[PDB]
Design a binder for this molecule. Structure first.
Ligand code: GCV
Ligand code: GCV
Lengths: 671, 671
């Protein structure tokens, strides 16, 4: 019915097998049961062996040992250094007797992640004769947000319908949920919100007795795979389903209603993760988001729940005429002032950028600006503005640029990753969340290669220091095999895809220029005169948003001095973000030597040629990939090439018609 | 529940009444029954009298006589000249005895229209002491097309939900259908298609036994008011509900299926009007529209049904890059060549313009170009591109410009009205159709004053020679009374509204510049790079579509020599249509003396001020109009003023940003 994605566990040849007679499972918990089953599955499929599962080591048998520190006979030094609950150690016994692999986790979850790491080593064909590994995740929260609706639709879903809901109910099918959990767990994802942040009528009832049994059934599966379950809530629930006259967070009965709702939820799901909130809301009653979030936080506190408060807030009724109002400044101006007013179990979830998941956006100034408030970054795996899984776009490189961005909050070495992993400000709760890119499509992600974005998200969530190169390598090998041509080719495609897509879309960081509504395809003035605050201000002389303090919106001042100065100056501002920070003449000379207008022409003409190359390189792999996936991808790559041509021409023509400046190289621009 | 619109029958004062003791109804048919009931209603409400209904004249009683020629004792000369079946004569007896009013119709329908004319005279307070009237409609078909869907929605409906359907079924309520029929009949409308031309799944079943009983129930009501009922059909019905493998009009079984469908329909509705068709279609199987239409025509022929084939056909996948392809030429190039190949009961329905109901479009070249093919013009009463009933837009003046347009098909005096009334080419069937502007809203049309467009459509349909001035006068008096200030003010508002709306929307006939999808509001580049063939080609130097033969698409050649030459020349082409026919520099000087760019600024700034005046004039009527309607309209006028400001600024800014030319008068243009 559907692909196994990167958990193929392809059968090894006779020269790449392992000899094991037993699996020693020191524990019998539901998680351990899933761990054992997964190990059996991988070893059976890959090695064609079926070790017996036991609870005590057989001194003379080759074994894989699974357990926690408390299960050890002799606690060696390495595992003794473990402090993170989800951390683990994998080491081969150094003695000369039977072969033994020890997978030691700080907790059961640790053993689960350790096993998937062990299986990953096998899929990649690593020598496990002398292993000595210690791994602890950097981010406490490694979450996935689903924008699934209960009618089956998925907001911004380009990979089919929801695998959770249908006909305003839960799918009677749960086997796919189990395989999805296995996939998420394989890359360390430990938290999930199953419903759209835009909570509609039916979804509002997910926190009521009518649907809680079903939610609990889903949570039971995820729990088995070390995944905590969350629900996006409707802030107006007290009114819509509570029978109350208001949703005011300060109203005594409203506060009580939520506390009772929390209690009720925990009776079905004892380890419920908490609420994800997109917010009639607090503003409706003159309350600020601290008051709004803290009320929900107080309801969940007794149960250990968390409130994930999204900071995607802005004036969705902005006047395009007013160049003093800047949507990019909204998030910071709204939350920065509230630092230190939020309850301990509240985590502010902030998008990587201050606008809205554009192909390229500078880093949200909020990161590093709130020392006393937990923060978590939200990235979008589903490609809303990045190709919608029609165009290939491996998002890992972009996410690393964001994660490695130094905010200088506490001087050099204050990278975003250190802000969200909680080390910089000692955040009790923090991490990263990704908007799911899956659907009912057999290949899960619409575009076969988009599977790499989900895999990659998990890898970065676990350890942001991993290189895009090794993440791509791991994914390709596990998904398509180790043929050097296949690996080198697909890895190259993945690693260069984002830049290629940006080349023929929005120029120099200004973003947008997409069709309104569905957001797919070129439309330079699409939202140019809208009330969404997404403008490029292109005219016959130049383009760009002046966000300088000197003459613009003053957005640059939201960054710490080092970055503020870099963007403030027209001479130091990076080319790739120039139009996001400065309004400049088309003739303005970039650091690359190109005028702004010629740069536009260059990347659009050249981006299309690069897209053709992606397709050509893929075609050269025919015969080395099964026919089904070969054609699924070829189909998409062709769709990409044809659409890229539309992006190229629409943008080139628009700017030629406005600037009146011809392409330096005389390439075809339709007048 | 809803307003009576123009059939108010307001109670007259004691000095404006009539003395009648009897109504002589010479016939007992369902139509006559409705006629009598309407007369009783009007006389009771207006005159507070209740004449007894009799079948024989009382020599000594003041009476209103109703009958046809065959019912007359003495057939006078006037009614003796009647030839049209729906014509009638109204004359006061010239003798000195009792007062007698004779309403003589050629057929029952004629008597119905005669009575409504009599009632109209009373509502307007005309002296009926010495009447001598003869009226015969110019257009055989005076039709209304409904874009209602069975789920209750109305495509391009801005006046509420369908009054016909709900929950994929017919409304159990029929009283509103009766009052709607009364309204349509009052203005001579004699035909109606009750469902959307875009026939969806459920609507496709309107031609099956499952829904025919309901359709018949609706048709029974309309029949009583002289209205023939039609259904829009799904050309693919043979496949969707017929169980056949194809819809090919030349497939033997397909032809048979339609003939059987027709027979079945006529068993429920003996006088069924026929099918309205928007067309898997003939093109799908390499057949032309003559073959497509003739197949349906052959099925209806034995029953006297008609096939209304819409010519709204074009490449909905046009390349914006190709300036040689012109959507405006499509309709003519598609149908002109087929003249003389259509069956006698087929009528080609053509929109007033060759594009798509824009605020201003030149006349469709098809009118006058097909001497051997019946034609009917389609106009849009619902204001899709003309304010959507938020902005006031009395469409009658525009329709008269189209109707009075001389095609010169047979030399001077070949106006569009003479083409569609069938007199120019002796068309057996022809006329005019209007896309309904009603909905479930209590005031029927969303905007109270939009009621005038429905009324006006009927009046022009009956007699295109009626002036916009008298049509507006009739409507205002009947709807709001005869206070001279009220009449003069509302009439002025109606008569100037269209020009006002055009002033702040699309300039000089180029059209569009609307938001995509819903089509409401400014968005200059909205469809500029779309595949719909709706482009203005504005750049930093000029704007316009070159449709000349000399250098453009050659669209001008579709008109007869006299009009072709007028539009072909840049010097003779009317300003109001200049950008539809020529691409010109912004500095091009118009006949008005304005440069094209300054004209744009002028009409947009001034159009807003004119809109403010509409509101001001309405406010001055407070106290002379009931509070409910006064405020309903004031609300809309305020909405109009505010939106006009958006139209003004968006368009002015777009062209300033592109042309770089400032407003001559230094008015506020946001940079
Ligand atoms: C779920 O709503 C989404 C929305 O579809 C998307 O287009 C954007 O505006 O951001 C959103 C968000 O992150 O709330
Ligand atoms: C019913 O479809 C409509 C359509 O809503 C409208 O936007 C336009 O394109 O013309 C149509 C037509 O007259 O078929």
């Amino acid at each position: 019915g559907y692909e196994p994605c990167w958990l193929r566990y392809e059968r090894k040849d006779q020269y790449s097998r392992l000899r094991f007679e037993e699996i020693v499972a020191k524990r019998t918990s539901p998680i351990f049961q899933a761990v054992v089953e997964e190990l059996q599955k991988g070893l059976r499929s890959m090695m064609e062996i079926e070790p017996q599962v036991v609870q005590e080591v057989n001194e003379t048998a080759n074994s894989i040992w699974l357990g926690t520190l408390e299960d050890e006979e002799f606690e060696r030094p390495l595992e003794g250094t473990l402090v993170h609950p989800e951390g683990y150690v994998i080491r081969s016994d150094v003695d000369d007797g039977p072969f033994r692999i020890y997978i030691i986790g700080k907790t059961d979850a640790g053993v689960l992640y350790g096993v998937f790491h062990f299986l990953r080593l096998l899929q990649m064909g690593e020598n496990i004769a002398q292993l000595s590994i210690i791994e602890q995740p950097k981010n406490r929260l490694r979450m996935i947000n689903h924008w699934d609706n209960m009618d089956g639709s998925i907001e911004r879903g380009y990979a089919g319908r929801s695998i959770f809901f249908v006909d305003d109910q839960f799918v009677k099918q749960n086997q796919r949920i189990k395989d999805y959990a296995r996939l998420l767990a394989s890359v360390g994802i430990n938290a999930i919100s199953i419903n759209n942040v835009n909570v509609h009528k039916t979804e509002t009832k997910l926190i009521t007795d009518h649907f809680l049994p079903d939610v609990a059934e889903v949570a039971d599966i995820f729990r088995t795979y070390g995944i905590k379950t969350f629900l996006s809530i409707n802030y107006a629930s007290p009114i819509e389903i509570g029978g109350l006259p208001t949703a005011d967070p300060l109203d005594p009965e409203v506060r009580r209603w939520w506390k009772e709702t929390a209690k009720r939820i925990y009776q079905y799901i004892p380890d419920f993760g908490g609420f994800v909130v997109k917010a009639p809301g607090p503003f409706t009653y003159g309350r600020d988001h601290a008051e709004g979030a803290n009320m929900l936080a107080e309801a969940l506190a007794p149960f250990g729940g968390l409130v994930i408060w999204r900071c995607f807030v802005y004036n969705c009724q902005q006047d395009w005429r007013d160049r003093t109002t800047d949507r990019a400044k909204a998030a910071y101006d709204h939350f920065k002032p509230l630092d230190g007013q939020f309850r301990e179990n509240v985590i502010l979830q902030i998008k990587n950028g201050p606008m809205d998941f554009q192909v390229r956006e500078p880093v949200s100034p909020l990161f590093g600006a709130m020392p006393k408030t937990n923060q978590m970054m939200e990235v979008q795996i589903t490609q809303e503005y990045t190709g919608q899984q029609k165009h290939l776009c491996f998002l890992i490189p972009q996410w690393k640029e964001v994660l490695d961005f130094d905010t200088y909050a506490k001087g050099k070495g204050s990278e975003v990753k250190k802000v969200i992993d909680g080390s910089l400000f000692d955040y009790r709760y923090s991490g990263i969340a990704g908007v799911s890119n899956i659907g009912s499509d057999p290949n899960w992600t619409g575009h076969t290669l988009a599977q790499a974005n989900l895999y990659g998200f998990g890898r970065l969530a676990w350890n942001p220091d991993l290189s895009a190169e090794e993440i791509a390598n791991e994914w390709v090998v596990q998904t398509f095999g180790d043929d050097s041509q296949v690996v080198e080719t697909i890895s190259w495609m993945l690693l260069s895809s984002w830049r290629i897509y940006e080349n023929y879309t929005s120029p120099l960081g200004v973003g947008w220029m997409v069709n309104p509504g569905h957001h797919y395809g070129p439309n330079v003035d699409g939202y140019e005169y809208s009330h969404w605050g997404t403008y490029h201000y292109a005219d016959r002389d130049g383009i760009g948003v002046d966000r300088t303090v000197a003459t613009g919106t003053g957005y640059t001042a939201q960054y710490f001095p080092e970055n503020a100065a870099m963007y403030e100056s027209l001479d130091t501002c990076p080319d790739e973000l120039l139009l996001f920070f400065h309004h400049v003449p088309y003739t303005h000379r970039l650091h690359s030597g190109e005028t702004v207008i010629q740069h536009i022409y260059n990347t659009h003409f050249e981006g299309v040629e690069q897209a053709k190359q992606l397709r050509k390189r893929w075609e050269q792999l025919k015969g080395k990939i099964d026919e089904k996936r070969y054609h699924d991808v070829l189909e998409r790559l062709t769709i990409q090439v044809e659409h890229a041509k539309e992006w190229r021409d629409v943008i080139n023509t628009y700017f030629y018609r406005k600037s009146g400046i011809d392409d330096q190289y005389g390439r075809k621009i339709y007048r």
